């Protein structure tokens, strides 16, 4: 029973036709403190494979050496660890899946929500959450935290149900998912301008763009806002 | 919140950042916690919504109603009412308080109201979540008499690193200049104090 | 601890052609002890009905005042109230008390006299007002009543039918409700005449 | 708690009460009387908290006894029931609630009918053929529900209670010391003061 | 839930409810609160189901391997400590079971014992356990005499739980009887409270109360 | 419950979901969320639903009586003042949040009312459960300049990023337009996107098959 | 302090007919207010003919689940692939629950097969192990509001042959697989309607001796 | 609580425990007997928590009839009084402590003295001449410190106790059922199947 | 406490305030929470004094270890073995920790172990209760690569600020430079920085 303390917020992700697509700021809050501001919260796992942190820094810096122990050890005696017997996807979900619900239940959490984002060798898209208590689940889109409250609404209308997900290109959804981004940047208090996206196409590979910043964001109407009511000047 | 008043050569200027946050969600990104209570007198607002609002409301009833018998309302006087509202009802409160008027014999003048109801009179003041951050910057960069350029200078760069560091702060940097010549009202966007 | 799980007790009222049913079931109990068997909670000012689940205290008090209000009301009025009028009388009564409510949940079951139109509507603790056209349901099995109504339900039902659904809905709700049940009694409402009907039901 | 019982048989009303008096270690007191007679053919017995207990019922006892007194006429069971259901209703939500439920048994002359009521500190009223406050309900009931008929004589009706006691003193973890019945009827209230080995 | 056990000179009467609750959601009226430890045992259900299912099931097993073991049937007074001490050694751990071990060995004849999770293991005459054992022991107490024909017993248990399951809003669905003889123990069906109490108070003229 | 409020180039418009509860239990699977406290200054309200509709009567009642009084239209300052010193009198006691807005002798108006007194003002506000939804579609559309029919759009979408994505919200969407210069037009079920398909079977018993004991007829006439 | 546990909502149904037996549920997954997936199937076809689904707080209905077909496995290995049958399997699943007493899986789970004798059998469990055989059960978020349903239509409580009076009850006809499959979409239209935590899609597992089949409805997603 | 008395007189002690189990709201058994035998001369009364109480008898009961066993001869009350002290007194730091206070009776065939110890949970161990565990010594303490002298006959030591008794029927709370009472001497231990009247 | 480490072009400087309190009673004026770990590895401590100087303690020990066996460590792993005691029992510890060391390869490094027990790189870090005072002062005065002396002024102005308002710092502000030249104390009196 531990209580995060360096903490990163939103992770969200959606699928499109050929792949998907996954993005989080770079912040690293300490309370209402914007401490830390060049903490990467995306981890690739190969290249096929991207896993998304929120919540406590600390874990997730631990989950992220649980990762790349994760890469050493599947390459120990395996010619084929770059071919056919390379980390999919799904094994390093389920992987974290496993060492997510063993932490609850010893009753010393691993406070984070992560999602595990890819492609599989045969091509499937891989989207799956899991968090602190072992709870997992897949939809065409994830978000964690505010995420949930905010991102999903929005990339739900682009993929709403499984047959929307091979009418949408990597344009439409890396459009949804920056504005997305953006949004969450004008109501959620604990975020950052700067965030990481990354896209895991199943014939581009994967794409991981850092340093990107919200843009166009509407802030005009500020000055014809005066008062909270009877004021007029 | 992260708000502050400076005094100078011409008068004065009030600050203040645009976001009232409920938890971590942003309630409003578009705030004006710059509020008037007489015609050159006005505050800024920190601590509860409500109890601001409620408090402000009250003050410039007071001090509308002051007028009437007794004429203009000095700064002093305005800074009066408010600290007596607030530790009058210290215990069902959570208001911090900046006075700030515009005098044509005292010019420029501040008041802080802190929590526990009490008055400072002071050279410029800040206060809300965001001031504890740069207490070390204003205490450095603060300097008496400087012109409205000098000023309106200090509080966008005190405010944008407030903003900087408080989560509980941010949104566009709202000012207002108060001086002989009349009252002003300034915006500054995020694009352009976020790169100072 | 829970007030309005105390004593226990349910009510359901429907709508059906040119006719409206409203019925409870007869327990009161004290937790777990069953107490009386005959305790009704539908009570009619005029040809407007007054279901009333909750700490049964209250629900006699409510009674007591519905009837002592609906009086004085018919002799300034020089008319018996109406359904929909009724309704707002009851809101603001509890409303009246939204501090220290009474805890219960009223239903109104009625045809208003001058339109023939049928009307029902069940409130919270507080007054919040609900006025559906098809079902309202009240009590310790409300959940159940609310499974039952929402499938056997069907709109204009005639008199003869809407008492097998509303007898239906009740009896099978109350059955799956330790304390509800006990005995229960049915309410036919249409232009003309009332039936009341009791019913045959576990006593366990 | 304490045993406060009453059955309403063909022509009459019977309250049997506890006549123990415990407080905490030691029981202070065999011989107590809970009961109260509000008029002629109506009597109200109690149980509860402490002071409340009496406060209570004498309370009630004087307004009704005005009421008697102003009017010349004696209230009827029902009537004085629901007197006694609307104090309680008013105290439930007061400053500070009187913890004291109450078994009302009273013949109406005018119906010629013996009635009992049952009513909680809440303001819970219920008219019932037999009923009881406390645990005592617990072990009775079943034993009525089984044994009970509406044309039972007083006599009938004075045997079902022994049973009662009975399984009451079997089963009870507690020493009520006994009971004093009494019984309600067209000619009034008496006290069957052999009862202890009736 | 009501469960009753008592000895007389037909050996030994068991009757049971079958209701089910969480709170005031009744989950079933369809529960066998009779635990058949096997055809000279019987065990009853009340407090937490699971706790008595399970620990009893497993009372069946360990009789069993105590036979295998001894070559011959364990008797009543055992089969209750074997109950009784593993529950102990539970104290404190929340285990929630209030039961009553019956049988008939030669060598004791007809015997009732009373095993809760406290601790407590008590042997006796007449048992009444569960939410509605106060409504059981009022029928009960009053109409037992060892002299019961076995009929007469069996009626006033089915009975007994009767009188329980509508006074108490926790007891009810349906009635399970069973005699205990030497030759083990003969099933009396189940019977469906709902009908049987009808059929009672026409029959009986008790429940005078009700309205029917 | 999901509320929203958008300012257009000539009046403002408000929206709203239908759904009332109780826990995960629906109470009402259509109630009017969209308060009227005077023809032309309508209120959406979350919250303790017992308090946004008594709490929207008391004032529109004072408000009327106000209006007749000084014999002038009644402005939504006044009713968003009324209000709100209402609410910090009691505390934040009195569970209701609300969306206020409307037309008067000085233009269209769009303010938010906090349960403990506070007020906002902007072109575009949202609350209740699905608060975040329907902020999430209007942060994404919003506009300088809508017309009346965008506007109606705009809010309506928000409403049903509530419906769909928050549990607390659900069934119809109902808005009011208050147009600078026209009458207010309450569109009560605007939008009725959740119609049950119909039942598999009908469960219409067979008359008899309830088993009754007794039978009587009641007395209505006095 | 920290809670290891958590709930996800859902609701499962099972009905046995004859010579089959069906276990259904809505594929909504859920925390709060907000809906994590509109479909996350919640039931499993373990093998040798067997389905099941452990509802309630979804980490715990995973491990158990598994943990169950992990035994299934494990069977056949030690006893020559020999088939499972339906009440050893549920004896099984008691011991796996009670296994962990102390430290409960949060969940309800039911499960569904036939019988040695071919016979449609369905099976529910205490979160802690109790369990009975029994004809239809419906469990999770809003069992309380289908299980009366089922009481009147699946086994004809308090339904009375008509005017015999009262006296005699409904015969107890048995359901084929067509009727069944309409009153589990009933159940689930009805449940989306009051529940909130209800919706989305309804999954129907059908097992016949023939094997495992799936249906497939869509819910209201509001 | 429940009625352990112990009384030693000129050549036996007396022992006198409550016949009464009640769980919660039911009085399940009238005739419990409170006992065991440790050995031929020497016998145990006990009372405390449900399980515990059992458990702790029968665990020293069958230490000593195992020392028995082994040395072919019978520990003195006093050794076996010093064994129940250790057991209990390792028992109250332990990590679930037995809730069990206990009256130890016997004749010292070696001394021909009977002899009585008052043991409690913590592992207080004291020699009286008369004791009790529970609430009975707060009312039958000053009737013996009253009516008691070292040479009293096992006659007059049984008057004693029904006084005791009476006093108990009297001012005690709780329904007891009686008491089962049992002579240890130099012949051993009996039990008086005649005090429901003696 | 108010402690800083600032890399610059010659490698890197550590400093500190003196105040060790407990309550409002100042226990030692003249603390050193400047701790030596390795030659030129060194460490600022902020938190329990326990727990600090029991881990520095700790991590001494492992590094004089490391080397016997495996000669110089890194200033990256010293931070390692900092930060896995830090985490590893996160739940019984309060401690905020800077790591600063300099390489001949690297030249300065700084690291900071926050409380959760997580590692950050950084140019340069404060940290101590005093700390918060002056973050919006040094993230405008911090420049990358300064000279020795513009470093320990920057140093000297920061904690001059937070001591002025941080009542939990104070005493006289310790430094300690590493570089190839090797390593310097320094110590500033009150008399001094009170008065910049
Ligand atoms: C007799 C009734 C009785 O004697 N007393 C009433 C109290 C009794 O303990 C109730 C018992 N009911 C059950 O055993 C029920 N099962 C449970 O209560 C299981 C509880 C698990 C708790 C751990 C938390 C789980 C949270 C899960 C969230 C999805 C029924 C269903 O078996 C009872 O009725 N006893 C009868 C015999
Ligand atoms: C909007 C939904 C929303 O904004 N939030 C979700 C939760 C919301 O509170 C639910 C609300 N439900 C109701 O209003 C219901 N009634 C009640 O909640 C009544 C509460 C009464 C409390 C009385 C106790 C007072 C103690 C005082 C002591 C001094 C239903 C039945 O109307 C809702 O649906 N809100 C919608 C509009």
């Known amino acids: 029973t531990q209580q995060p303390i360096v903490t990163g917020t939103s992770v969200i992700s959606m699928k499109y036709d050929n792949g998907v697509i996954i993005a989080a700021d770079n912040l690293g809050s300490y309370g209402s403190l914007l401490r830390f501001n060049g903490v990467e919260r995306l981890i690739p796992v190969g290249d096929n494979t991207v896993v998304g942190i929120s919540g406590d820094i600390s874990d997730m810096q631990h989950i992220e050496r649980l990762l790349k122990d994760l890469v050493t050890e599947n390459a120990y005696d395996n010619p084929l660890a770059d071919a056919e017997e390379a980390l999919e996807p799904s094994y390093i979900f389920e992987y974290l899946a496993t060492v997510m619900y063993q932490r609850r239940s010893k009753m010393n959490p691993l406070w984070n929500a992560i999602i595990v984002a890819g492609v599989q060798s045969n091509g499937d898209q891989f989207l799956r959450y899991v968090n602190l208590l072992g709870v997992t689940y897949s939809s065409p889109t994830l978000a964690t935290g505010f995420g949930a409250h905010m991102a999903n609404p929005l990339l739900r209308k682009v993929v709403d149900r499984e047959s929307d997900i091979p009418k949408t290109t990597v344009q439409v959804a890396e459009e949804a998912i920056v504005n997305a981004m953006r949004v969450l940047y004008y109501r959620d208090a604990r975020s950052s301008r700067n965030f990481s996206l990354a896209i895991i196409d199943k014939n581009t590979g994967l794409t991981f763009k850092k340093n990107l910043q919200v843009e166009n964001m509407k802030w005009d109407f500020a000055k014809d806002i005066k008062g909270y009511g009877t004021q007029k000047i | 919140t992260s708000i502050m008043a400076v005094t100078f050569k011409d008068g004065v200027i009030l600050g203040a950042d645009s976001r009232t946050t409920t938890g971590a969600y942003i309630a409003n990104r578009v705030t004006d916690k710059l509020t008037r209570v007489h015609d050159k007198i006005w505050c800024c607002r920190s601590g509860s919504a409500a109890d601001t609002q409620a408090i402000a409301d009250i003050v410039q009833y007071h001090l509308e109603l002051y007028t009437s018998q007794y004429g203009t309302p000095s700064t002093e006087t305005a800074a009066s009412v408010?600290?007596?509202?607030?530790?009058?009802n210290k215990d069902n409160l959570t208001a911090g308080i900046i006075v700030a008027g515009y005098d044509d014999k005292?010019?420029?003048?501040?008041?802080?109201?802190?929590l526990g109801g009490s008055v400072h009179k002071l050279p410029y003041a800040i206060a809300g979540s965001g001031s504890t951050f740069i207490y070390g910057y204003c205490?450095?960069?603060?300097?008496?008499?400087?012109?409205?350029?000098?000023?309106?200078?200090?509080?966008?760069?005190?405010?944008?690193?407030?903003?900087?560091?408080?989560?509980?702060?941010?949104g566009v940097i709202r000012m207002v200049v108060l001086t002989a010549a009349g009252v002003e009202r300034l915006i500054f966007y995020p694009d352009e104090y976020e790169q100072l | 601890s829970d007030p309005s799980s105390i004593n226990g007790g349910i009510v359901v009222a429907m709508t059906g052609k040119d006719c409206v049913a409203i019925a409870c079931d007869l327990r009161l109990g004290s937790q777990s002890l069953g107490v009386s068997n005959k305790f009704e909670k539908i009570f009619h000012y005029g040809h407007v009905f007054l279901g009333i689940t909750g700490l049964a205290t209250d629900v006699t008090t409510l009674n007591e005042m519905f009837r002592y209000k609906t009086n004085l009301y018919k002799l300034k009025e020089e008319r018996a109230i109406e359904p929909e009028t009724f309704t707002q009388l009851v809101s603001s009564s509890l409303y009246e008390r939204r501090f220290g409510p009474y805890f219960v949940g009223p239903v109104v079951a009625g045809i208003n006299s001058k339109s023939g139109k049928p009307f029902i509507a069940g409130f919270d603790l507080i007054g919040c007002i609900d006025e559906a056209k098809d079902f309202i349901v009240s009590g310790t099995a409300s959940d159940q009543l609310f499974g039952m109504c929402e499938s056997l339900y069907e709109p204009n039902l005639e008199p003869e039918d809407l008492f097998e659904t509303i007898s239906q809905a009740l009896l099978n709700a109350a059955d799956r409700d330790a304390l509800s049940g006990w005995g229960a009694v049915v309410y036919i409402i249409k232009k003309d005449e009332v039936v009341k009907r009791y019913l045959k039901m576990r006593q366990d | 708690m304490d045993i406060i019982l009453g059955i309403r048989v063909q022509d009459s009303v019977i309250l049997a009460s506890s006549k123990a008096v415990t407080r905490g270690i030691s029981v202070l007191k065999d011989s107590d009387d809970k009961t109260r007679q509000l008029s002629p053919h109506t009597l109200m017995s109690f149980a509860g908290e402490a002071g409340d207990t009496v406060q209570f019922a004498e309370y009630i006892q004087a307004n009704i006894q005005l009421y008697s007194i102003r009017e010349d006429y004696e209230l009827s069971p029902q009537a004085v029931s629901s007197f006694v259901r609307q104090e309680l209703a008013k105290s439930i939500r007061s400053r500070r609630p009187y913890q004291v439920n109450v078994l009302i048994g009273g013949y109406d002359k005018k119906k010629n009918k013996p009635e009992l009521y049952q009513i909680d500190y809440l303001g819970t009223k219920v008219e019932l053929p037999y009923g009881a406050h406390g645990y005592s309900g617990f072990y009775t009931f079943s034993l009525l529900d089984h044994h009970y008929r509406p044309d039972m004589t007083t006599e009938e009706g004075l045997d079902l209670l022994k049973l009662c006691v009975q399984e009451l003193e079997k089963r009870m973890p507690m020493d009520f010391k006994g009971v004093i019945v009494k019984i309600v009827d067209k000619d009034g209230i008496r006290q069957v003061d052999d009862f202890q080995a009736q | 839930t009501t469960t009753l056990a008592f000895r007389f000179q037909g050996g030994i009467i068991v009757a049971v409810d079958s209701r089910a609750t969480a709170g005031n959601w009744v989950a079933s009226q369809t529960v066998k609160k009779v635990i058949e430890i096997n055809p000279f045992l019987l065990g009853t259900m009340a407090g937490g189901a699971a706790d008595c299912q399970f620990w009893e099931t497993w009372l069946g097993s360990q009789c069993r391997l105590h036979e295998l073991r001894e070559k011959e049937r364990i008797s009543v007074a055992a089969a209750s400590k074997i109950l009784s001490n593993l529950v102990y050694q539970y104290k404190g751990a929340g285990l929630s079971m209030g039961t009553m071990i019956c049988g008939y060995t030669r060598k004791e004849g007809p015997t009732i014992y009373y095993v809760d999770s406290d601790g407590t293991r008590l042997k006796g005459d007449i048992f009444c356990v569960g939410s509605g054992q106060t409504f059981a022991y009022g029928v009960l107490d009053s109409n037992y005499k060892w002299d019961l024909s076995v009929e007469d017993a069996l009626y006033l248990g089915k009975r007994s739980i009767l009188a329980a399951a509508h006074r108490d809003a926790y007891s009810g669905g349906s009635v399970?009887?069973?005699?205990?003889?030497?030759?083990?123990?003969?099933?009396?069906?189940?019977?469906?409270?709902?009908?049987?109490?009808?059929?009672?108070?026409?029959?009986?003229?008790?429940?005078?109360?009700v309205i029917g | 419950t999901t509320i929203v409020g958008v300012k257009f180039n000539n009046g403002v418009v408000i929206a709203a979901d239908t759904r009332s509860t109780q826990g995960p239990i629906v109470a009402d699977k259509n109630c009017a969320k969209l308060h009227r406290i005077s023809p032309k200054i309508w209120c959406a309200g979350a919250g303790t639903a017992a308090d946004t509709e008594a709490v929207t009567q008391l004032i529109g009642s004072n408000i009327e009586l106000h209006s007749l009084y000084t014999s002038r239209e009644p402005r939504v300052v006044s009713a968003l003042q009324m209000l709100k010193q209402h609410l910090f009198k009691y505390q934040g006691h009195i569970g209701a949040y609300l969306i206020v807005a409307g037309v008067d002798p000085t233009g269209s108006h769009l303010f938010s009312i906090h349960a403990h007194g506070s007020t906002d003002v902007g072109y575009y506000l949202s609350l209740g459960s699905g608060s975040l939804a329907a902020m999430a579609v209007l942060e994404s559309h919003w506009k300088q300049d809508l017309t009346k029919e965008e506007a109606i759009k705009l809010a309506s979408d928000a409403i049903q990023a509530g419906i769909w994505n928050d549990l607390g919200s659900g069934s119809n969407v109902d808005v009011c337009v208050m147009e600078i210069g026209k009458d207010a037009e309450y569109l009560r079920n605007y939008l009725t996107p959740?119609?049950?398909?119909?039942?598999?079977?009908?469960?219409?018993?067979?008359?008899?098959?309830?088993a009754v004991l007794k039978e009587s007829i009641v007395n209505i006439c006095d | 302090q920290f809670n290891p546990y958590g709930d996800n909502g859902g609701t499962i149904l099972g009905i046995a007919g004859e010579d089959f037996a069906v276990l259904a549920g809505d594929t909504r997954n859920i925390t709060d207010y907000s809906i994590n997936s509109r479909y996350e199937p919640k039931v499993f076809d373990c093998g040798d003919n067997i389905v099941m689904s452990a509802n309630g707080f979804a980490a715990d209905g995973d491990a158990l689940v598994k943990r169950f077909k992990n035994s299934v496995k494990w069977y056949h290995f030690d006893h020559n692939d020999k088939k499972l049958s339906i009440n050893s399997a549920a004896r099984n699943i008691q011991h796996l629950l009670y296994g962990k007493r102390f430290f409960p899986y949060y969940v309800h789970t039911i499960i569904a097969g036939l019988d040695e004798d071919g016979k449609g059998a369905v099976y529910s469990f205490d979160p802690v192990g109790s369990y009975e055989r029994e004809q239809c059960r419906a469990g999770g978020a809003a069992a309380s509001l289908i299980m009366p349903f089922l009481d009147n239509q699946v086994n004809f409580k308090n339904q009375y042959e008509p005017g015999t009076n009262g006296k005699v009850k409904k015969p107890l006809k048995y359901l084929s697989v067509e009727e069944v499959i309409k009153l589990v979409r009933d159940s689930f239209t009805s449940a989306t309607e009051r529940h909130i935590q209800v919706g989305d899609g309804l999954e129907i597992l059908i097992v016949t001796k023939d094997g495992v089949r799936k249906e497939f409805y869509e819910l209201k997603r509001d």
């Open chain 2, 106 to 114: 005292n010019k420029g003048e501040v008041y802080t109201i802190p």
């Open chain 2, 139 to 170: 205490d450095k960069n603060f300097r008496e008499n400087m012109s409205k350029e000098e000023t309106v200078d200090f509080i966008k760069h005190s405010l944008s690193q407030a903003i900087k560091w408080d989560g509980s702060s941010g």
């Open chain 2, 82 to 88: 408010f600290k007596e509202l607030c530790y009058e």
């Open chain 6, 194 to 210: 959740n119609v049950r398909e119909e039942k598999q079977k009908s469960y219409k018993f067979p008359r008899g098959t309830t």
């Open chain 5, 176 to 209: 399970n009887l069973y005699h205990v003889t030497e030759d083990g123990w003969i099933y009396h069906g189940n019977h469906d409270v709902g009908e049987l109490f009808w059929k009672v108070k026409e029959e009986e003229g008790s429940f005078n109360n």
